[PDB]
Design a protein around this ligand. Structure first.
Ligand SMILES: CC(=O)Nc1cccc(NC(N)=O)c1
Ligand SMILES: [Zn+2]
Length: 139
């Protein structure tokens, strides 16, 4: 699990969004595994605005932060999970590293702030849903 808090926005894995997230929907994209809901409290996180391909992600299944190199956001085929059928996920970045389902929502960061959240994994790969293109999160 894990969320991003910026302005009056909460960014979560679409597959982990609660009834409260859906009752306060700002935007959702099923192909990206992302959902943003409205909050009453002011978020403390900064979204990276950059095209960095190196960073550090939190891996709850190892209680550790790992430094990774990752691909630029793209359309990648993603095998079946407990939450989606096999399909193409958009705006997805891959790194070589450890990921398990409950690692979803772990934050990837560079010097410029939050890059994205863990969304896919297995076969020694971790996939992160990019949030850097969602410029409207900042105002
Ligand atoms: C370990 C494996 O094969 N599945 C895996 C790994 C990381 C994240 C997800 N994502 C998801 N279940 O939505 C799935
Ligand atoms: Zn950056």
């Amino acid at each position: 699990s894990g969320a991003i808090y910026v302005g009056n926005y909460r960014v979560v894995n679409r597959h982990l969004a609660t009834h409260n997230d859906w009752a306060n929907l700002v935007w959702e994209d099923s192909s990206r595994d992302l959902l943003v809901s409205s909050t009453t409290a002011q978020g403390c996180d900064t979204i990276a605005r950059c095209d960095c391909q190196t960073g550090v992600y939190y891996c709850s299944s190892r209680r550790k932060h790992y430094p990774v190199s990752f691909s630029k956001p793209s359309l990648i085929f993603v095998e079946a999970s407990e939450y989606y059928p096999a399909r193409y996920q958009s705006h997805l970045m891959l790194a070589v590293g450890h990921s398990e389902p409950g690692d979803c929502g772990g934050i990837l960061r560079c010097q410029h702030g939050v890059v994205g959240i863990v969304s896919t994994g297995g076969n020694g790969l971790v996939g992160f849903a990019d949030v850097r293109d969602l410029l409207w999160l900042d105002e």
